[PDB]
Amino acid sequence: SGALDVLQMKEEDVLKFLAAGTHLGGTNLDFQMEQYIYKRKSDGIYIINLKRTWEKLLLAARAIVAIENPADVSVISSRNTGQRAVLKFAAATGATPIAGRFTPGTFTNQIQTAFREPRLLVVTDPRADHQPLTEASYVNLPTIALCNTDSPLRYVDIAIPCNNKGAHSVGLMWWMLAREVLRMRGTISREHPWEVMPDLYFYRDPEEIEKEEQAAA
Amino acid sequence: VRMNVLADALKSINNAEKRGKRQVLIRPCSKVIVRFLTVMMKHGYIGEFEIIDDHRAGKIVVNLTGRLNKCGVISPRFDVQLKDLEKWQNNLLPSRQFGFIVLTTSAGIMDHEEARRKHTGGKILGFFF
Amino acid sequence: MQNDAGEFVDLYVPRKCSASNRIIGAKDHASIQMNVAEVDKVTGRFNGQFKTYAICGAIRRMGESDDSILRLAKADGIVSKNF
Amino acid sequence: KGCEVVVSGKLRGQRAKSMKFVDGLMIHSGDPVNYYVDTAVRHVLLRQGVLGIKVK
Amino acid sequence: GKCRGLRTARKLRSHRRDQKWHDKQYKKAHLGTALKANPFGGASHAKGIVLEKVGVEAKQPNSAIRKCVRV
Amino acid sequence: GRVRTKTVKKAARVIIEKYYTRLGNDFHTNKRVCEEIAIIPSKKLRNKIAGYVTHLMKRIQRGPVRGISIKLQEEERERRDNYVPEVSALDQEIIEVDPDTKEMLKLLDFGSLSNLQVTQPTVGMNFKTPRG
Amino acid sequence: TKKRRNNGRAKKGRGHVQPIRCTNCARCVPKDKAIKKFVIRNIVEAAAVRDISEASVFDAYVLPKLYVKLHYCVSCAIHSKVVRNRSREARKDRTPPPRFR
Amino acid sequence: MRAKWRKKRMRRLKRKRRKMRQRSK
Amino acid sequence: KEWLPVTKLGRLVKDMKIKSLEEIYLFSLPIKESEIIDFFLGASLKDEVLKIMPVQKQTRAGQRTRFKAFVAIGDYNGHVGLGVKCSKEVATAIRGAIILAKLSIVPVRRGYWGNKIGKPHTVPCKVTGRCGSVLVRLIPAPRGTGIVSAPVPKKLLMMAGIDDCYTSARGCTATLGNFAKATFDAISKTYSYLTPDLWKETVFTKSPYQEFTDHLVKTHT
RNA sequence: AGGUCUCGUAGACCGUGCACCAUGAGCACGAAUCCU
RNA sequence: CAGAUACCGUCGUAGUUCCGACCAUAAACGAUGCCGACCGGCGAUGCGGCGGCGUUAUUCCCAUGACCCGCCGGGCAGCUUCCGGGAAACCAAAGUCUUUGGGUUCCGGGGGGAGUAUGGUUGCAAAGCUGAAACUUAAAGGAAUUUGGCGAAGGGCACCACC
Numbered sequence A: 001s002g003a004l005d006v007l008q009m010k011e012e013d014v015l016k017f018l019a020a021g022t023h024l025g026g027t028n029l030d031f032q033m034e035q036y037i038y039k040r041k042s043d044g045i046y047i048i049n050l051k052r053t054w055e056k057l058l059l060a061a062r063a064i065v066a067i068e069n070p071a072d073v074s075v076i077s078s079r080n081t082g083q084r085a086v087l088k089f090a091a092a093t094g095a096t097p098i099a100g101r102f103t104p105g106t107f108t109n110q111i112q113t114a115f116r117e118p119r120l121l122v123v124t125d126p127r128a129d130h131q132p133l134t135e136a137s138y139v140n141l142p143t144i145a146l147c148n149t150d151s152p153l154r155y156v157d158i159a160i161p162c163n164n165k166g167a168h169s170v171g172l173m174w175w176m177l178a179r180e181v182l183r184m185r186g187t188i189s190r191e192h193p194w195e196v197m198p199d200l201y202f203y204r205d206p207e208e209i210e211k212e213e214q215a216a217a
Numbered sequence B: 001v002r003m004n005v006l007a008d009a010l011k012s013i014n015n016a017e018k019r020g021k022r023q024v025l026i027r028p029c030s031k032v033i034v035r036f037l038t039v040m041m042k043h044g045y046i047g048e049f050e051i052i053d054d055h056r057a058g059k060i061v062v063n064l065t066g067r068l069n070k071c072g073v074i075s076p077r078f079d080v081q082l083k084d085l086e087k088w089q090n091n092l093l094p095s096r097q098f099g100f101i102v103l104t105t106s107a108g109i110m111d112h113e114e115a116r117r118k119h120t121g122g123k124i125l126g127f128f129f
Numbered sequence C: 001m002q003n004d005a006g007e008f009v010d011l012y013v014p015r016k017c018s019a020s021n022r023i024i025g026a027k028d029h030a031s032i033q034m035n036v037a038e039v040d041k042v043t044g045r046f047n048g049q050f051k052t053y054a055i056c057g058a059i060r061r062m063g064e065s066d067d068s069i070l071r072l073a074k075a076d077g078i079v080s081k082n083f
Numbered sequence D: 001k002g003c004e005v006v007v008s009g010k011l012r013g014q015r016a017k018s019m020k021f022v023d024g025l026m027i028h029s030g031d032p033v034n035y036y037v038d039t040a041v042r043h044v045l046l047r048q049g050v051l052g053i054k055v056k
Numbered sequence E: 001g002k003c004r005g006l007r008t009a010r011k012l013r014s015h016r017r018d019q020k021w022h023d024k025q026y027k028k029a030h031l032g033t034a035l036k037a038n039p040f041g042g043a044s045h046a047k048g049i050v051l052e053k054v055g056v057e058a059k060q061p062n063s064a065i066r067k068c069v070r071v
Numbered sequence F: 001g002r003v004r005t006k007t008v009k010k011a012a013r014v015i016i017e018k019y020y021t022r023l024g025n026d027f028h029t030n031k032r033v034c035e036e037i038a039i040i041p042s043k044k045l046r047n048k049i050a051g052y053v054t055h056l057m058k059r060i061q062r063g064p065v066r067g068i069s070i071k072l073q074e075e076e077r078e079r080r081d082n083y084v085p086e087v088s089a090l091d092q093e094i095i096e097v098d099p100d101t102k103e104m105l106k107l108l109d110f111g112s113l114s115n116l117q118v119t120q121p122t123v124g125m126n127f128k129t130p131r132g
Numbered sequence G: 001t002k003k004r005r006n007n008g009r010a011k012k013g014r015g016h017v018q019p020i021r022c023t024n025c026a027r028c029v030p031k032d033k034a035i036k037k038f039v040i041r042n043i044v045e046a047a048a049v050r051d052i053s054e055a056s057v058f059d060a061y062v063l064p065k066l067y068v069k070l071h072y073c074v075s076c077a078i079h080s081k082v083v084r085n086r087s088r089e090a091r092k093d094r095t096p097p098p099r100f101r
Numbered sequence H: 001m002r003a004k005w006r007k008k009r010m011r012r013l014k015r016k017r018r019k020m021r022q023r024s025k
Numbered sequence I: 001k002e003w004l005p006v007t008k009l010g011r012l013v014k015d016m017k018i019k020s021l022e023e024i025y026l027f028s029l030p031i032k033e034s035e036i037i038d039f040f041l042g043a044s045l046k047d048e049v050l051k052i053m054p055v056q057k058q059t060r061a062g063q064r065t066r067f068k069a070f071v072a073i074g075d076y077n078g079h080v081g082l083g084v085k086c087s088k089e090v091a092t093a094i095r096g097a098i099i100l101a102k103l104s105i106v107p108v109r110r111g112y113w114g115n116k117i118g119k120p121h122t123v124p125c126k127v128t129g130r131c132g133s134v135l136v137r138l139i140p141a142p143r144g145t146g147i148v149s150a151p152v153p154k155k156l157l158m159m160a161g162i163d164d165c166y167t168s169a170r171g172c173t174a175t176l177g178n179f180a181k182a183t184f185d186a187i188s189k190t191y192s193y194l195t196p197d198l199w200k201e202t203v204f205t206k207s208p209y210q211e212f213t214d215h216l217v218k219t220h221t
Numbered sequence J: 001a002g003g004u005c006u007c008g009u010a011g012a013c014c015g016u017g018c019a020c021c022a023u024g025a026g027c028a029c030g031a032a033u034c035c036u
Numbered sequence K: 001c002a003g004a005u006a007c008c009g010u011c012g013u014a015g016u017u018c019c020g021a022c023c024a025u026a027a028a029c030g031a032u033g034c035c036g037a038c039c040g041g042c043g044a045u046g047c048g049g050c051g052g053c054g055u056u057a058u059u060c061c062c063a064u065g066a067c068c069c070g071c072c073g074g075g076c077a078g079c080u081u082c083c084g085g086g087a088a089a090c091c092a093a094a095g096u097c098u099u100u101g102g103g104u105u106c107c108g109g110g111g112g113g114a115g116u117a118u119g120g121u122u123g124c125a126a127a128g129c130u131g132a133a134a135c136u137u138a139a140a141g142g143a144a145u146u147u148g149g150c151g152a153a154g155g156g157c158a159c160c161a162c163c
């Protein structure tokens, strides 16, 4: 995680960070999040670091590429903001997606047909998805989380500080997470731009869907 | 009001041990704590400890690892002879293989095994295991 | 475990956490053995070296295990020294 | 798909007690009880009393 | 165990003494009233003479009359 | 009180999920389809199924419902979230930036970028709502 | 057993408060324990305000209100349906009821 | 019976016992 | 009477790639199939009933009876467990009791008293277990003394394989379910007590699921 | 010069006690385990 | 009202108010003794002090009153919690407790008899403190789940209920 002179951001990742507004956080703070946040500026918005979040993406990417079976990463989103980027991430990396209404029996009930117990649990918000962590507690399951400054830190193992409110920041950082996973896997090159689009991970309201339908072809 | 210094020091380091802290700020710096922690280092339980000295009662900084369970203080200072120490390690010590009972003597401050080897008893201080 | 002869009496020794250094019970299912990867030194890809880490259930239920894993990876040499 | 045995009478005491052991599916109401359920009621002559059997 | 001091023991003696006087078996075993109220006078057996026979009834869950003598 | 039970609703659900092309809004036509595709013991239950399939067709024709996954409406979601537009709305020529964030980007690994435009700071931090 | 964290009142570090009376009855009840109501009212309701309006000397004459403060004992509060009991888990809610209209 | 009225009848019988004490010396 | 596993751990056990439950307790996988321990512990695992207790619930028409059975299982040189199941009839009560007891067994450690000769006889150290109001304390004893306690933790320690123990109790031990759960807490805490025997840093072997997840994904879907 | 400003109209929180209302003879109840 | 020297309504002596001489009793209850050390968070609140953008006592300055953003120490309290404890209700103390010992004062051994008799003691009086025994009883009690019954409350239903 950043120990090499190749595993940093060159010029463009911080540009996408500035474009998506990932540097803006919530007003209130947590008692575990003072080290991941630089200072507190005017109008009550905490300004977060970017090197530290980059190191968290590197650590999470190392955790994903550590196992050899791509089907043993279960990624779960119940909120509608990142429910499609989970499906595109599972399409790109072979993971197991859950999108909306996580039923309370996938990890602990044996007679159900949806009986899954993988190596890795990847979740989008500990504040909203307080439910899958408590059920995944009873199995030896690590937790990769996409944490906000107001999100409580409980049953967590790697906390990636981000802005999980706007859909652009979330879809961008899932796209970068998939990009790191395919980089350490070796499917894609490390210097050649493989960028098919970052627009494939962005979710939007149906009013803007109809507006784009009428504005475009 | 502060009455026993060693009792407060061992209560603080025991509370920070059970919570899980690594660095402990002990408020006073009486020399009996220094002798106790030298016994604890040469016994091998805790690691290195600092001492901050000033023109008043300074502080103690102790680096902890997960090798201490509970250290206690017997109050008041009971008198223990060599002929009665085995009853103390029966009703106080958790096992006969380990756990050490420190005591002050005329030849210094040490554990019970050194006191049995050098054939000298004295007043009690505390225990750890 | 040993005796005056020298054989190990205990059937197995239980693991300890590399950050917590307290023992984990047989029914503590919240204790995990999380595994991370090691990168190659020129190309930036996986080779096969692992750094297995373990953490207890009490800190995981407390939720301060993430800084423990961060300190463990800093002592291992994974996270950058500037950071 | 489902059966039961219902017994009653004088069991191990002076008071009357009934035991029923059910397993599976069984339908009470409607016309389909007529051509799916066969019931036999018989009297058992014991020494302390008379005992009944209900099978469906 | 409340008082923990190296030279406070007569207070512990007085406290244990008064708290022992606040008992029931120790109250009956160390007073003359309990021994003098015993008709046997601290004896296992005693002799006597019978004056008349009295038939007393039993308790309400178990209805009977018990034959007794007045000695 | 004319409410449908779970049996007729589940039956209509599965026959409208598995059969869609050979259907219609006419009650008699899909009633005859309910004769052909499903063995039914009764006729009042048949009328219940046919009326509920007609009602669900009128519910489908205004929009999708969350009970079925029909193949005619399927892959429309995939086409609708699988497009790529020309502009990503993120590689813009303008990015609007705060002075404290400029002090952050001064200290990370850059000194000054050519896509970096500054605002003046605000005059008052009256951000929290009055609650008491 | 203990029913509330407080004791149906607002006395925490005081020990004694000045008692008042009720309005429906004359029961002497302490100030912090008594339920108090302050409702804003009109002199005439929404059926008579028109008969005030066209049958008056002055046009656009704003009608005065009725400001009165009521203090009830808890028995006459529950009996006259001022406050209603709730569940044990739902008792811990200090917010007033919402006012849609 | 609550404790208050049995305390009251105790006070009444103690008062009449004190009166018979002063009138029966 | 064949076995069709529903867990990946059960499939990997039925593929004879686990030597013993030692590494299963070492990595602390959740055991949820009762037939795995039956596959591991064979003729050396026998049991005896503790108590049959009537529990009644009052309804509109009469009283509703329901029977709970306490059973304690255990191999006589190691793992023991306790299982409680409550049902209407006694047969499925005792069947669910022995099944749930085979679900939850724990490993034990045996230590010496003063000197170190032969195989151990007693607990390594003073361990305490609490639940409800019962206080159960296990104290090491010299060789040849025998288990001395109340009779039912005495027979539970006989199932434990522990030859000698010194036991003391406080409170209502008449509640045999609470007493049995408390002494099971006292026995099961024998690994959650750090002793100077285990102070080296433990080496980390690979997880068995990590070792044979390729075989599992080539076996099932 | 135009000559009804626009957008949907919970637009019901009028009220407070409420007549007198007591008692029930005891006998009449049982607790559990596994294959050939 | 069967009875009402009770619930209700009208009068109403002492008292309710102040001065002075008295008794020292409460659900005098946080039903939780005093001091001191330690172990999580958050948001407001009252005092005194400290730092800093801006607004106002009308446009410049100074520190002030009033603010906003934060901090310190004391105090009344609030929300969540697999820190921990307990029989539970619950408690950031009712925690640091079989792994039992920081210092110290008072106080209780099943339930009645009984806070009773007598003895002492203070008071004008009422009474206050100290305070038993004989004898009788296997229960008296605390927390909580399920049907019960409310002249308790909220949604409905019934010509075996009403209009």
Ligand SMILES: [Zn+2]
Pocket (backbone or CB within 6 Å): G022, G023, G024, G025, G026, G027, G072, G073, G075, G076, G077
């Ligand atoms: Zn009132």
